[PDB]
Amino acid sequence: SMNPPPPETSNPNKPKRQTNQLQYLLRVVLKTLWKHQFAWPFQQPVDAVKLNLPDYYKIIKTPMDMGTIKKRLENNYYWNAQECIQDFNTMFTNCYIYNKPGDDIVLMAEALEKLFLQKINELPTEE
Numbered sequence: 001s002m003n004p005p006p007p008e009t010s011n012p013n014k015p016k017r018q019t020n021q022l023q024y025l026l027r028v029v030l031k032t033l034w035k036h037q038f039a040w041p042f043q044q045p046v047d048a049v050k051l052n053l054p055d056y057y058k059i060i061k062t063p064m065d066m067g068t069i070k071k072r073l074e075n076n077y078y079w080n081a082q083e084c085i086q087d088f089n090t091m092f093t094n095c096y097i098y099n100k101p102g103d104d105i106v107l108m109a110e111a112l113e114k115l116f117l118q119k120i121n122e123l124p125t126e127e
């Protein structure tokens, strides 16, 4: 019935770096997932008000979405690739916690996560 503030996508107090791995995450991983036919439920924060999900933010206390991850990558928010991978994992895990197995949203998250893992296993060695 009321949405929380969305996750931050900038913060001058957070340490940040540019790495070839973070470049890969934006140019390959995020690009591939963003354009996927099943991307759209994950491209913005869950609007629990508009979607009539009064329980969502009573269950999901660490929200994350690909729109936020996209902005964090574009804004050079991360210190390393593992911080970004964690955000993706939070997004997927939130979906499985809130929804039921076999739900359409869970099947779509599972398809995206399979592709995410295929791309992550080709993550370049840090130069």
Ligand SMILES: COc1cc(-c2cn(C)c(=O)c3cnccc23)cc(OC)c1CN(C)C
Pocket: 040, 041, 042, 043, 044, 045, 046, 047, 051, 053, 094, 095, 098, 099, 105
């Ligand atoms: C970000 O946008 C959307 C999210 C969801 C959505 C996402 N996730 C992750 C969920 O767990 C979830 C759980 N229950 C119900 C809905 C969702 C659904 C959408 O449409 C049905 C849109 C589309 N909006 C333009 C309306």
